[PDB]
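Closing statement on the magnesium ion sub-project.
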Amino acid sequence: MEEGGRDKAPVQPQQSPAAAPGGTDEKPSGKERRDAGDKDKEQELSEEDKQLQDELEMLVERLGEKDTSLYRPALEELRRQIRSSTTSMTSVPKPLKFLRPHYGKLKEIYENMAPGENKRFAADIISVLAMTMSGERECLKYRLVGSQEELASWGHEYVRHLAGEVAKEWQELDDAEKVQREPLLTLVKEIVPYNMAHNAEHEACDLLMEIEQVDMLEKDIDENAYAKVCLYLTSCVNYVPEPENSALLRCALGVFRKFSRFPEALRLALMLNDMELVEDIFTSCKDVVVQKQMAFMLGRHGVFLELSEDVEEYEDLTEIMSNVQLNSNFLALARELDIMEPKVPDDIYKTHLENNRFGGSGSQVDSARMNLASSFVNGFVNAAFGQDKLLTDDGNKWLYKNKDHGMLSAAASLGMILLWDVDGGLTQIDKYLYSSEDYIKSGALLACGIVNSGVRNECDPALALLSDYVLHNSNTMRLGSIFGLGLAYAGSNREDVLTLLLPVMGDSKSSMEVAGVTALACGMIAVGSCNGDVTSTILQTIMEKSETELKDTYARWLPLGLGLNHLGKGEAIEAILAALEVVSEPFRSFANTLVDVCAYAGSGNVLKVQQLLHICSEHFDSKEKEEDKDKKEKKDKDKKEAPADMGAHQGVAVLGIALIAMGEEIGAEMALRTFGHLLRYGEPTLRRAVPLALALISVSNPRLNILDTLSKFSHDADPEVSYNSIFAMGMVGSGTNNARLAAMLRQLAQYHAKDPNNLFMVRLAQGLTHLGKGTLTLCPYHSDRQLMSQVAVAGLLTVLVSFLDVRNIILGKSHYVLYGLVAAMQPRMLVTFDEELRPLPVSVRVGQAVDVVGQAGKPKTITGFQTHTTPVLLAHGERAELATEEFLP
Amino acid sequence: ASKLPLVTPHTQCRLKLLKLERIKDYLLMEEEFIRNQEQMKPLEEKQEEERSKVDDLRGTPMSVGTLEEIIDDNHAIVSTSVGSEHYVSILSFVDKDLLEPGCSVLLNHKVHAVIGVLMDDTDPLVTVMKVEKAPQETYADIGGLDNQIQEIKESVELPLTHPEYYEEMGIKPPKGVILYGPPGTGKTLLAKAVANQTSATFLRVVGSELIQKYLGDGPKLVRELFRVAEEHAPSIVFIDEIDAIGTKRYDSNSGGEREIQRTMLELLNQLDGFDSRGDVKVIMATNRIETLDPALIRPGRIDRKIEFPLPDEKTKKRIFQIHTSRMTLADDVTLDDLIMAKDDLSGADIKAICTEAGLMALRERRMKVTNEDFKKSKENVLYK
Amino acid sequence: DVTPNCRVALRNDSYTLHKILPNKVDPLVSLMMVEKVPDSTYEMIGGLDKQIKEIKEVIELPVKHPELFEALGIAQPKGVLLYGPPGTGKTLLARAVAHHTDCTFIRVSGSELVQKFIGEGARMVRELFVMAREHAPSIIFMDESEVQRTMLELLNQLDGFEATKNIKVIMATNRIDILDSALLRPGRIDRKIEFPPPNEEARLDILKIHSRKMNLTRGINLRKIAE
Amino acid sequence: TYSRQIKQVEDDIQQLLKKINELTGIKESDTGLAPPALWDLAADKQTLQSEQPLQVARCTKIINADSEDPKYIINVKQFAKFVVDLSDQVAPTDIEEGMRVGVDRNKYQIHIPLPPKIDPTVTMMQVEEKPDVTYSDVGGCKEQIEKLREVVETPLLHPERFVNLGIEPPKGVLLFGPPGTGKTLCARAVANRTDACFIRVIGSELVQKYVGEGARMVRELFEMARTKKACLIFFDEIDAIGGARFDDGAGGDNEVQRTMLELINQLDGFDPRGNIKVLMATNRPDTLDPALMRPGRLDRKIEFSLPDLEGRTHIFKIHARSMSVERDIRFELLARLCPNSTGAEIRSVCTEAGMFAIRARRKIATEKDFLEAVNKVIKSYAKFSATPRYMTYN
Ligand SMILES: Nc1ncnc2c1ncn2[C@@H]1O[C@H](COP(=O)(O)OP(=O)(O)OP(=O)(O)O)[C@@H](O)[C@H]1O
Ligand SMILES: Nc1ncnc2c1ncn2[C@@H]1O[C@H](COP(=O)(O)OP(=O)(O)OP(=O)(O)O)[C@@H](O)[C@H]1O
Ligand SMILES: Nc1ncnc2c1ncn2[C@@H]1O[C@H](COP(=O)(O)OP(=O)(O)O)[C@@H](O)[C@H]1O
Ligand SMILES: [Mg+2]
Ligand SMILES: [Mg+2]
């Protein structure tokens, strides 16, 4: 310990502040010149951020704190310069002069007067001087003042601009990663009124930098994936003009303001569609922005590009509508027939091979329900132009044999044979349509609504399925003619045929298998307005569901189209609109949780989760509302699909340990559909945790719950090595797990993963995380599998063709005007980069590099080389124009 | 445990805020999906009850068996400790994987069914041939060479520490490194500083101890040696004095020079096999570079050939300054007279003269070393 | 209380542990028991007094006083070569020094009954170092080319590669001009000590110490017998 | 601003990960147990079902049967020999003699036949896995690639052009030349391309300690080889497995010669390997025995020489395609400076020539960097050069 000798700072700043009450009165020169020699020496001796152990900042306040407490308040005649020498010296060490109750008394030194132009002694220093002190201001002082005292005195008025020049002081000194420290100031400052600080920093951000918008930009989109409802409401509309005013990157506008479409205002992204139709620059980014407006996240847009300039750029709309959809056809017409796919692969039933020699002999399984699964030897393999001529004979000779819903099934498989088609899908039905059969005609014409899905051209606004519907006095002519029109027009918001399908609800006909899927058909059309649909559902719900206490034909079908009619908003008005609408006995208050959480698909509002588990957790429920708790766990299946790769880990760490092992009914019977709505992504954290409850058949329960989780477990697309865990389970499934109720189900499980080698992107996360409907077409099946009385009769309308929004599979696409370039691509693991050094290292899977139409995969991001510069849209979106530029010799 | 590998950010980013609050989403939502288990069906504890149900399946007489084959439908032929093998079945708590032919397993006492697997206490030979700690000081101990230090850092250290320079170049490091010169020139002494420098697993073998007395035990020792070398990770294998396999004949080896030859065939495979080799660097040293097989010295098996010349006199004085650093040198001595004492003295000669001179001081209990200690020290060391 | 490499009592019905069986052997106590070296002392040294002082400087000092070499900043010696004709006191000297400084006098001979306590095959010689670092203040001794390669294989480990100290080697042989030049590297060997045949003075005292256990007759004139 | 507030919200939720994952049960780091959720198949049913009804059924070996009766003669590991009987679950057809069978401990009767012993050191030398070496990487010896590939895979991939012409294709080939010439690397393209069992054999792995021990490994090799339909057996460095027979005075080097003669007998005569193709690769062929060198065992005889000029230039284009270079360099000048050079030497010129660019501060090498590689690799290492007493193969 070497003390003494060089003690000038523990002596003369120990003497002259002690002689400062002895030199304030009756000594006018020593009051100000020793305060000047105290000010500039504490300034210059604390500007450097290498000597943080200053010789005054932790040394003078052993007596200079009590001297300051009798120096600034107890003087009472403070003039105009001695406050500039006093409050500029006494305000610097005060976050470390005081201990942790500084937060109520930052103001007894500073709010006397802010001395002049405070950044003058905060130019070189980064954060020791007054930026940590300013975080202490905006942490506590502006929170207590601006809790209900926003429009106020000096505590807000100068604090706006003091929160302006310090926020520019973050982008003034070094341009390090302390740039992203500024939305901490803009955020913790006025958390709910975020617009008043983003107006103070938006134009300063416009004059900030043109390269320092991108890490702050993704910094703001991450924050804008979810928040509290007002924070996500305000910070997302403040997110929008940053690539518009400062930057002109301007091509990620549509897919990243689908974020900002539903919660804020449905006309706001229509004004941003106007902002798409203003920047009329050219052809490339103009093409690529409106590529996604048809069949990548939304539809219902094809009446807004018929202005007075219809030559090619406003004649883009038909090419958006069907010709790049014909490029989605051209994928499988030209680019999948050359890679692997033959006309009849057929060999997954051939992959069911060696059970005749696995343990003796075979030729034993002769179950009649096996041919329901042998319908998909035709059906599931024939996606992506699997057209068959005299190879549909497994549906032809079974089409005329038995199984009336199998006559609906083999005739309904033809739409899965001809998918995304308008060219001949009406012609391939007509050779098997004419049979004078209620079940063949309604399944085949139900497949007519499947073929034109996404086309929405002139196929049948009131042409074919209206002619199918007007025949009705009976079975599926009445039923399977409203499903395909909602399926094909699921992307449309046309009101007229919605009012053609409104008397289907208002008929009050006793065909309840039709009246339940009527709500599932009209719910797929609109997600916003038209309260008359909701009135039409609830009036028949009162006329029918009230005077009965019976099965889930009502519960699985009628409020689900109301959830689809009020999907996607966190405003918590629709829960008041629909929860107080069906005030009733609790079996009609089954619909309390439908519209409440169906509006809450992707957000973070965990206060919804505590009111999603804490009202009805167990209560031991002696056979009263087990279905209402199955639906209460069904609405725990969102908050789970669109948060994107974040917090999904212990989604699986305990989703075997919460209900499926030692619940009562909700997990042993229902809650493995949390894995059936969560993902198809594919990872062993659930993929090796589910056969510990699936290979455990546990036959003491109603074992078709576990067999209901069998095919659903096999719900996962992007085909993998799961033929072990499913073909072994079907190998024991020959002897045990009786084929009298499961022969459709095990090969339904096996044939589901590898439908076709491709087209496996149905999982509601596009670009990075945006939705793309994907829920209106997927939800009523996982709601529909109440695990009974629909594996044989009623649910064969849904179990075939429920989800049909398959936006194909890959992103390897050139789309130059000639279509002569192939690519320069390099597929990798999902993005690592947030912020680091210079060109931030993007990701780490450099070993793969492609140039052609090849596969997508689950966690992949794809970049390039060759100085092509990929200048189109810069984030994601799978149809880059791919122009090139070579100003780099 | 391997929950989320996104640990990039390195500032106050909101991604870091929202991602850790979304781990708080998977943990708050699903800690409320942890509460309900023993609330609804207690029925056991499941922390020890099912565990003691396994432990009541398996008996306390746990016989230790050995695998030799696997049939997939949880039964296989396992070897007893006697030798009389059985055809027992395999349980469900056996985690069907850590099962290789030759693995130590746990069987029943009654029906000898495959209860468990056993962690292997390895073999002592790995601990024998494996260097544990850093031997000595750094490259600053060496002095005077300064050229091939860049060569050994070039071929070994720089590929390890900087995996960027070869990738911006589109190139791979050179494979084999060989060291040759007069004896006592610091050939092993460089590998000492390498074993200081690296963080990779380091193995060292003398070329004399390759040879054996039984037939094929040499090449088998080679095969398990490179097995041990590969089965870890990034590794450095050092071979000292590999001429001794070809120079000296011993009567312990039953096979003649055409057993040494076949050992050289096996090693000649193990340098450049068709197999995927891995991250195993090879550093070799000898003094009779002219004697051994040039088929092993070809580029592809050894890429870098490094000669060590004799120390020049200006480097000699540096080596004197090294080995006389921390000693109480009396000012009687003149090192320049000690330089030209031998015209071709090695670096070991300097250190030997220094240590023996210290021995001459400790014969007389002094603290400093005088000139006559060196005068009779060069007579003792050099002239005999 | 359960030690590795220890016997136990066991019950037979359930194979429950009963009681710890006392002890058995070290794998080195049996080894030197098989070898049976003639234990010696200073009190049976016949006239080798300067050689005693030479061997104390190499062996005795870096046990009792290792800091004394860090007072000079030099490394401690490791290897001893004893040479001269047979029958000159090499074995009793090397046994004696370890006996007085309390080290594990472990000679190696390359036999095969020694083999079973070192290992099952012991493909190297280096597996002895397991027992050697377990008896860490130890001294390895060697007789008069398998010894010559063996010593090099030891010295290559204890060149800086073995970190455990207090392990030193002694080779005893004759005719130094026919051994290895790599063993004649000047930095390799730390000290070589010659043992001459005894003169008339040193033939007398071995008769003196050796004459102790005999029942004599008064008046012998041992000087004439030594002459 | 929320500097500690992001840190403690990080750490309490990363800790609360452990605070509930200990409540799940993955803990109690075992001595060979399963994870505690994994095993629940054998929880209540198979605990008393795969244990209590189930036997041990100790496996045995059949000596022979007899006529008119089952009356089997069994054999076990150490114990005595019994007259045993079938079960009712199996036919007496595949209870053929010299066969392992599972046998109960009390009645001592046969339950199920077993596959024979493979001696798993012979199992380990099946490759199970393929390298990535393409025939494009073996450029410079294209006619040798064709003359080899017409023998290796063309009857295997097309067994109709030879049968319908009426010829039986050859089964044997040796590959020989100087070291580093691309023989082993050339075989890596074969193990890349092919599809059947690729069982590799290195000649220094068969040298055993006992007498005749290695010859039985040849036997088990060809026994598991004849079980398969088609197989490719690779031989490397066959000078270790045999040169010739030269024995004079005291018997020296006898043991390897018996394994070599066993390999001869397993190659020709007495209902041959059938569909088993062999492929040798050696360094010096002059040492080899002529009865081994007889066609019918070693039909194709591929030499690997040095390239003339253009194969060398192609090798420059192989190893120099994927490295940052000056654009306007020429490789033909480099090939004129290497009259006698192997492809590994050319690769060392390239890989050193990039290190010259790594020497000072350059991202792409130059022509003079190549010239700095040529004089060092070619002319400064020219003391060793490894070739000239192997051109004559001595
Ligand atoms: N250039 C040098 N500078 C300083 N000390 C050296 C030098 N060369 C050798 N020495 C010393 O001499 C001793 C012997 O050196 P080293 O073991 O490297 O010789 P070598 O050539 O490896 O012998 P061999 O390879 O035949 O065993 C080392 O302990 C080292 O301290
Ligand atoms: N024609 C060639 N083209 C490119 N590289 C070659 C060529 N010939 C040899 N090489 C290089 O030689 C190296 C080793 O080849 P290989 O192991 O096949 O030699 P070999 O002829 O089998 O002799 P040895 O049996 O001694 O190894 C390979 O890494 C390869 O890069
Ligand atoms: N100085 C001595 N005093 C007494 N006995 C000695 C002396 N030197 C040698 N001997 C005798 O020689 C024997 C030891 O021989 P020694 O030379 O140590 O073995 P080696 O011949 O293997 O070197 C002892 O039994 C001892 O009687
Ligand atoms: Mg050395
Ligand atoms: Mg080779």
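Chain A touches chain B through 46 residues (CB under 8 Å). With this model delivered, the sub-project is considered complete and its resources will be redirected to Aim 3.
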